[PDB]
Write a protein that binds this ligand. Structure first.
Ligand SMILES: Fc1ccc(I)cc1
Length: 162
């Protein structure tokens, strides 16, 4: 169990442009293409990301390559963020995966705003952090995925994914 397997479970794999839970054009293992309603705009982003004319379709190798880039970008965004880095550095490796998962789904800026949850996590008040994390649009809109991530923060185990 590692961040790649965890996010692969949470995001699935689709080789043609699809819409995420918010209605936004996406491809692969949860790679957001654009928030624009234009499918042509999404296709342009895809071609730029892959480096060829894709027609809205990629290979599994390409999906996995984008996925590695996206996971790394989430980690780098954490490490460059003055609010997120101290919390991340305080966590064990399993809980660090839960943190990356949140940043992958919502972005550095959104997670950096989870100020009270982050403090509880840094204080290792796991049950209180889990309660606080669920008081969110995130939990209400994607409750099964948020429950898995929250259980990972609460327990420091992979139990929710097993
Ligand atoms: F550094 C961190 C980034 C995101 C979370 I959620 C927790 C720690």
């Amino acid at each position: 169990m590692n961040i790649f397997e965890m996010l692969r479970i949470d995001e699935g794999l689709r080789l043609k442009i699809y819409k995420d839970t918010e209605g936004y054009y996406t491809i692969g293992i949860g790679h957001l293409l654009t928030k624009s309603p234009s499918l042509n705009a999404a296709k342009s982003e895809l071609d730029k990301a892959i480096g060829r004319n894709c027609n809205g379709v990629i290979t599994k190798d390409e999906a996995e390559k984008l996925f590695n880039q996206d996971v790394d970008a989430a980690v780098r965004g954490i490490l460059r963020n003055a609010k997120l880095k101290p919390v991340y550095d305080s966590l064990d490796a399993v809980r660090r995966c839960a943190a990356i998962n949140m940043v992958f789904q919502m972005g550095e800026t959104g997670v950096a705003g989870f100020t009270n949850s982050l403090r509880m996590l840094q204080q290792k008040r796991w049950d209180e952090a889990a309660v606080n994390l669920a008081k969110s649009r995130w939990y209400n809109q994607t409750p099964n995925r948020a429950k898995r991530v929250i259980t990972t923060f609460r327990t420091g185990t992979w139990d929710a994914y097993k």
